[PDB]
Amino acid sequence: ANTGEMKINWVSRYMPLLNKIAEEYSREKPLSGFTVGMSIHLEAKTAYLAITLSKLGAKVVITGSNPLSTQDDVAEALRSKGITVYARRTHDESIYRENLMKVLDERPDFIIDDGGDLTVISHTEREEVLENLKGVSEETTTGVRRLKALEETGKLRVPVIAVNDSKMKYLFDNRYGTGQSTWDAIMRNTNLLVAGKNVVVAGYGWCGRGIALRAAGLGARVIVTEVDPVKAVEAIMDGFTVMPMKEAVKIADFVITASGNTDVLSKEDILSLKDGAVLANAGHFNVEIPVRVLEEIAVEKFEARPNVTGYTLENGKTVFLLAEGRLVNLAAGDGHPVEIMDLSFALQIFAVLYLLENHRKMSPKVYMLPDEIDERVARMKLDSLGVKIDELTEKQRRYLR
Amino acid sequence: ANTGEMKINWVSRYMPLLNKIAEEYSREKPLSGFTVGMSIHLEAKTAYLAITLSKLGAKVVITGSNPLSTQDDVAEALRSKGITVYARRTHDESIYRENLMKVLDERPDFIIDDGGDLTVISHTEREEVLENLKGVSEETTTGVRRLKALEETGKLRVPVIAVNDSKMKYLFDNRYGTGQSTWDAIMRNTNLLVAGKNVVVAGYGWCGRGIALRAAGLGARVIVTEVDPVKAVEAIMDGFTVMPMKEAVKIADFVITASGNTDVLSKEDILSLKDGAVLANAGHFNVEIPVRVLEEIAVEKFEARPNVTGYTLENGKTVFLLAEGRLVNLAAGDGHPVEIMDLSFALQIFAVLYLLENHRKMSPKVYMLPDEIDERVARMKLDSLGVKIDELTEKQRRYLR
Amino acid sequence: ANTGEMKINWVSRYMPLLNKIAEEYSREKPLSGFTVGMSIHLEAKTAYLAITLSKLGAKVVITGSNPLSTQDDVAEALRSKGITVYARRTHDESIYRENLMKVLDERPDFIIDDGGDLTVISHTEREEVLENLKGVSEETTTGVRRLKALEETGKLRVPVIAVNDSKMKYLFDNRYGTGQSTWDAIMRNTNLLVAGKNVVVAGYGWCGRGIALRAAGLGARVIVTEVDPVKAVEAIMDGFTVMPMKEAVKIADFVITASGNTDVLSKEDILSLKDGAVLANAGHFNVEIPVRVLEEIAVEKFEARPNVTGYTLENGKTVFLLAEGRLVNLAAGDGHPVEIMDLSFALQIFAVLYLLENHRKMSPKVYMLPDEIDERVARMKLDSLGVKIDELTEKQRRYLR
Amino acid sequence: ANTGEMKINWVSRYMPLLNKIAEEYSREKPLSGFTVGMSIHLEAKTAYLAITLSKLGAKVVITGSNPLSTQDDVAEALRSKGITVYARRTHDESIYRENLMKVLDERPDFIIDDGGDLTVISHTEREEVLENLKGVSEETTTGVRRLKALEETGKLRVPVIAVNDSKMKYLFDNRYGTGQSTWDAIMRNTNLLVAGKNVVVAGYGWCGRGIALRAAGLGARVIVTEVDPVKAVEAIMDGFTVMPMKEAVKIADFVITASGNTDVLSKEDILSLKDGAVLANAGHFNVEIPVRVLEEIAVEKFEARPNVTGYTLENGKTVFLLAEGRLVNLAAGDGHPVEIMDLSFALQIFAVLYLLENHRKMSPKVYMLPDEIDERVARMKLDSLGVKIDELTEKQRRYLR
Numbered sequence A, B, C, D: 001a002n003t004g005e006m007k008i009n010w011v012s013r014y015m016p017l018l019n020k021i022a023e024e025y026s027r028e029k030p031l032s033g034f035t036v037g038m039s040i041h042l043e044a045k046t047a048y049l050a051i052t053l054s055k056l057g058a059k060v061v062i063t064g065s066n067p068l069s070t071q072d073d074v075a076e077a078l079r080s081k082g083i084t085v086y087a088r089r090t091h092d093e094s095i096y097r098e099n100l101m102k103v104l105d106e107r108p109d110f111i112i113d114d115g116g117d118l119t120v121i122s123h124t125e126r127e128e129v130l131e132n133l134k135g136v137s138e139e140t141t142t143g144v145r146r147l148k149a150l151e152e153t154g155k156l157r158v159p160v161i162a163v164n165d166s167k168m169k170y171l172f173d174n175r176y177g178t179g180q181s182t183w184d185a186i187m188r189n190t191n192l193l194v195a196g197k198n199v200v201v202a203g204y205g206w207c208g209r210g211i212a213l214r215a216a217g218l219g220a221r222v223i224v225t226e227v228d229p230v231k232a233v234e235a236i237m238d239g240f241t242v243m244p245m246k247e248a249v250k251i252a253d254f255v256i257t258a259s260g261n262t263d264v265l266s267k268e269d270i271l272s273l274k275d276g277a278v279l280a281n282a283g284h285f286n287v288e289i290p291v292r293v294l295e296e297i298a299v300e301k302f303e304a305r306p307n308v309t310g311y312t313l314e315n316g317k318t319v320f321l322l323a324e325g326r327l328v329n330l331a332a333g334d335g336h337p338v339e340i341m342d343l344s345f346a347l348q349i350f351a352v353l354y355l356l357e358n359h360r361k362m363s364p365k366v367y368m369l370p371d372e373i374d375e376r377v378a379r380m381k382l383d384s385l386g387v388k389i390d391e392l393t394e395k396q397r398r399y400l401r
């Protein structure tokens, strides 16, 4: 309450956008009477999202998506601000859906949820809320995948706004954010030098490039592994070396998966890995780096550092795995940078305020964030940054037509 | 003939893809009987395109998009290889359309043309050819704009393939190509230092970024001007400074337009320009930098260097303009790098070989290059580069589904 | 003991050089009978230095240069390996010199000390040890400053080797090390975004450039402030913007002192600092950023984050200070990267083994590390990195002469 | 005269420093009566050096160090400004020393010469001038090598100032200058793509790093070959890959020597070079890349492009050599960038004005440029660039002491 108060005060002074949203809507309180339910990693940052939603006059009901990572002192700071928060260090799967169930026990008008776990529970086990439910906002990718399977099978009966697709998210979340946060998680938990070390990045998309770029930034010799030749050729042009994972693994000092795939490393590769090879996953679930395969194949297994688990193999070489193969920057770092998140939230807060406005006009279909929002957030960010860009004149506006 | 022969031998050893296309189709000669007509900047590189088309068994009939000489040693080298080439020797367009007319006087099956000047002449003044004409390939942007105005007004009656849109073009043409070639044109014609000088780049798209990137590569302090906030915000994130052209112009050492616009500089800005400011256009026509406005406003006007024209203004300050405000890397450099062009051509050679195959199956509509070609060219490039990437397995291919 | 054991096991697998020194001298035990005394920041890394010295057969007697930062569990792990370690969370100034006194109470042959606090205590209060004392190694800068004041006043009567000057230290310590460790300390303690933020670096020497470089690496727009025009001119050429601290301070998001000076910021500048400006010192003592001046001028003062202290000023703007103005990467991070340290140690280990060899041959004077050591460590590093460089042939060796 | 006039007008507007030296000494004409003799590559830039010296009131007597590169229209423009210039497309070795002889036939007070060819001719064949001769300025390296062999054998009897050693030259000449000018020479003469190509830089000193840096700048994957492990280790840390020339040569697209050595490539390596490998020398004489060895070993030899000579080897692979193995940016480019040269000149103009002042005070010894000049030029450059740096205060000036 007094610590979780500070963890939020710190975050608060660096969420420029949300503060702007909170002084251009705070008075008009457009979300009064309306109650927003949400399932999301609970910590200082996501909490400021809830707090500014509340500042807009909404009744926020949160669930601790992260049972393990629930920061007690923060959840308590939220309650003392009039925000229903159902979170427990449950650890047991059973208790999660139960909390999910309790937010629905509040029949919300709008829902900003995780992986569609909340909106899907409604459409298949609790239609009560399904009626009062006016709109849904989905940031994840798993979720959007799910809330689309519904739309295609006509089972979906509420408008959804996927904010995972907008050049502003891909830029700040996927590129700059996961880029900085991934390397920060890696060096705060290992204190290894990055300069003059071979870093292998598996996958060269938004995240791959970001991680790669930042790595080059730290002085690393970057090697990129790819499956899509078009990306592989771009990596070359970017001054990097491209090779098969089978061949790269033999020289890597760090290996980072950033592909939305599985088993990016085979028993083979892992056995080629040189001694002291640190592996991290900055992509999907915990399947990019074969954790199961490591566990079995391991002769020994031990905790070396707070977030580093080491595995000694038959070859006598021992490999380290950050955050147990889970999303390294989130489960070992601070997630994304405070302002990076500020923007990823600002987008969601507008996705909600959009659902509220063009409420009815919308039909039970999953919509991609409206391009008008990106333009808005960008202008707001430039504005808080003290940057002013040129405005298109009529001679030109005409010319372009 | 003996010089133009070498200018082609040089290019020839660095067109990896076209040589691959010429030894995997050279024997099978799939373009026999077929005659390809084309309007394109005539020089060593574009000539190797014609030569490899001919290697495939085609009768190539070329027109000199660009005003050449009667004995231009390259044109003569092509003739001595059995390639009808109608080169223009004037500035006035009277003679240009005339040559355009003579390629049609050969009634071609396929056409790789410039700005649609060739395919549009057919549909509106020469329907004879319009029947034998089986397909058209359009690389430009003005052209595709034009050959679309037709399709929309149903006046188009032949399938068209726009190769201007494919991530491979945007990458190699727009980014790395114009990026390198633009700075090369600028420093071979001025020999000024780039390090520690303020470079202003107007526009931050594919070309903007590339030029920007490369400039930073040369040591310049880059300033970006933009109209689209989403791009402007990305420029900040990339470590650059963003300001209005009005404000940047006061400190620029070089100014480079890369926006598809006009009058990126007003009389105002030009008079703010410091003395010795070199301006170049790497974008559209010769209207990005107001050449007309410079000519009028100028107190003096003189040729300083082979491609630099200087204008002394009322303020006593004199500004320089590269390539008369025209596309600087093309009219002052060598166009794009040899292999950059090799790829931009390889794409077109396949666009033609596609029109030939899926010939009839296609209906008088403008099609975007088939994604299967990009994938192919990339694989071919990686292969000549000696790079091998990972192949997707079944566990994963299944997983992704 | 079981935690401090791991904190050392971790470090141990990433100290390539020291392990090499520990298997090319481990058997020969050249430091038997000899006891090494040392005053140094006590933690996992410096401990492995002591451990490998002991592996060489020396009796190591350590003092906790850092009273406050003494990691009990690590000190205890050292003791359980036969290493006298006098460290206490003393906090009281009095107890520091007392432990310094107890290592002398062991009359050492060689001394690797901190700021000359140990060798100066001998020459001015305890000449007993001054006789058995055979050699001294000085890594600091303050120390070497001091142990030179002695040599010049003939008060010094023992050979000293200053390892602070060698291109290998300046490279790994001053450049890459402090460069990475500084940004790591700053982002693990604030989780702020670095991309698209103005970073101001005061001073452009080894450390300035490194910090600058890395900052650029993270996406920041870098501004450099300098007093030596030669450096300032180099910063421009490197693509950065240079201005007076008075002017830069008005736009900085981070300010980092890296000059070996004091009051790099005046009451003035601090009052120009924008709200939320984070300040960090990566240079000398805690005087670069005027901490005293902040404390007085402050209307409020509060702890915001574990290593961030915030000061609200009369202007209502509040500024933050990392690690209380002390060396930010050391007192808020992990000091330098593990391998960076491995090399900074390897150099000292040889400085000792040099004092042992060319023991007598040397006269009571302060010597700069012998260039022969740099060459050795570099070759050892290249070797552990798996890098092989060309060997000069006779045609060339002769040619160069 | 009217062309050579413009080639000089162009250069003139981008020699900020020399213009400043020409309006802070132009009135005072401190070099009246005094005649300056000099042997230097004659072209627009070096000519502006002569012209500003003349502006200071000196009688300039120039020789065309470059017999082949003498730009007639420029030499004639100098004469029409009252400057004795002995230059001829001699081509014949005999005629060079003859012109050298004619500048001495003018008995100069000061000499800015090339490789000591002028000052050494005096001390060994023409002592007449040796008496009136008051001072000598040496910029080269060969020269300084020579004029030192004299000093050591007491044969030297006139004060010499070596401007080749000053951090300002190493910076602008060796680093940024040769760095930009080298890549410009290479891409204006080949138009090959640099991005995504392997660039091998032999030698990692001031020149090596610059070339390397810039190459990375253009998107190349850089490979560095070195003999000094300290540099090799720095290259790794800089994000590059280091290997033996024998191994790098097999994958290079460009090879650039920047070591002050010979036969950086053996018959062996040359035969490993892949087809189309372009080689350039940016270092010493024409012996870094074994031109003689190429000539012999070659099965064919032909001119491919104005500055590219190609050699087809027994293995059927043909390699290209820029500028015949000579300093590539000078003999194939424009030498260094205009302002880079402006600074390298400004330094020499002060070295002369220093010889004039502290004329007698100096004894027949070779002196390294006085650090007071570096400081001066840097301040002058910062000033023309519109940059203002902080001034050290008393609290600090005292502190530092």
Ligand SMILES: NC(=O)C1=CN([C@@H]2O[C@H](COP(=O)(O)OP(=O)(O)OC[C@H]3O[C@@H](n4cnc5c(N)ncnc54)[C@H](O)[C@@H]3O)[C@@H](O)[C@H]2O)C=CC1
Pocket: A141, A173, A174, A178, A202, A203, A204, A205, A206, A207, A208, A225, A226, A227, A228, A231, A245, A258, A259, A260, A261, A262, A263, A264, A282, A283, A284, A327, A329, A330, B390, B396
């Ligand atoms: N760390 C974080 O906080 C964040 C993580 N992500 C995750 O990062 C992953 C990738 O993000 P994006 O780059 O935007 O996806 P993307 O589609 O833009 O890039 C994916 C690339 O991975 C490559 N790839 C697939 N399998 C591979 C394999 N076995 N080896 C090497 N390369 C392979 C593909 O060819 C593709 O180009 C996603 O799973 C996403 O959920 C997304 C946002 C933030």
Ligand SMILES: NC(=O)C1=CN([C@@H]2O[C@H](COP(=O)(O)OP(=O)(O)OC[C@H]3O[C@@H](n4cnc5c(N)ncnc54)[C@H](O)[C@@H]3O)[C@@H](O)[C@H]2O)C=CC1
Pocket: A390, A396, B141, B173, B174, B178, B202, B203, B204, B205, B206, B207, B208, B225, B226, B227, B228, B231, B258, B259, B260, B261, B262, B263, B264, B282, B283, B284, B285, B327, B329, B330
């Ligand atoms: N030099 C060459 O060889 C090549 C030239 N181009 C030309 O470059 C131009 C742009 O190409 P791209 O960048 O890839 O398209 P793009 O759409 O990605 O770049 C356009 C950018 O310019 C900005 N912009 C428009 N007007 C502006 C103004 N008045 N001031 C500042 N910014 C402005 C837009 O907001 C946008 O971000 C086109 O005209 C194209 O034809 C394209 C390929 C190669």
Ligand SMILES: NC(=O)C1=CN([C@@H]2O[C@H](COP(=O)(O)OP(=O)(O)OC[C@H]3O[C@@H](n4cnc5c(N)ncnc54)[C@H](O)[C@@H]3O)[C@@H](O)[C@H]2O)C=CC1
Pocket: C141, C173, C174, C178, C202, C203, C204, C205, C206, C207, C208, C225, C226, C227, C228, C231, C245, C258, C259, C260, C261, C263, C264, C281, C282, C283, C284, C327, C328, C329, C330, D390, D396
């Ligand atoms: N944080 C760490 O772990 C490390 C810290 N250091 C410390 O960093 C400091 C600098 O190290 P170096 O850069 O190698 O010395 P340096 O001499 O190479 O750099 C110092 C620079 O500060 C500039 N400077 C002085 N006063 C200034 C002012 N008022 N404003 C702006 N610039 C100013 C000087 O012109 C000089 O170039 C030293 O005090 C050193 O002990 C050194 C190594 C590691």
Ligand SMILES: NC(=O)C1=CN([C@@H]2O[C@H](COP(=O)(O)OP(=O)(O)OC[C@H]3O[C@@H](n4cnc5c(N)ncnc54)[C@H](O)[C@@H]3O)[C@@H](O)[C@H]2O)C=CC1
Pocket: C390, C396, D141, D173, D174, D178, D202, D203, D204, D205, D206, D207, D208, D225, D226, D227, D228, D231, D258, D259, D260, D261, D262, D263, D264, D282, D283, D284, D327, D328, D329, D330
């Ligand atoms: N192109 C131009 O206009 C200019 C050329 N130079 C020339 O560049 C050359 C080097 O300049 P710096 O870098 O300042 O000298 P440097 O000493 O700073 O760097 C030269 C490096 O070459 C390396 N080296 C020597 N032999 C080698 C071999 N066989 N293989 C691989 N590496 C080897 C050495 O370890 C040395 O560090 C000199 O000969 C100089 O005259 C200098 C300035 C301008």
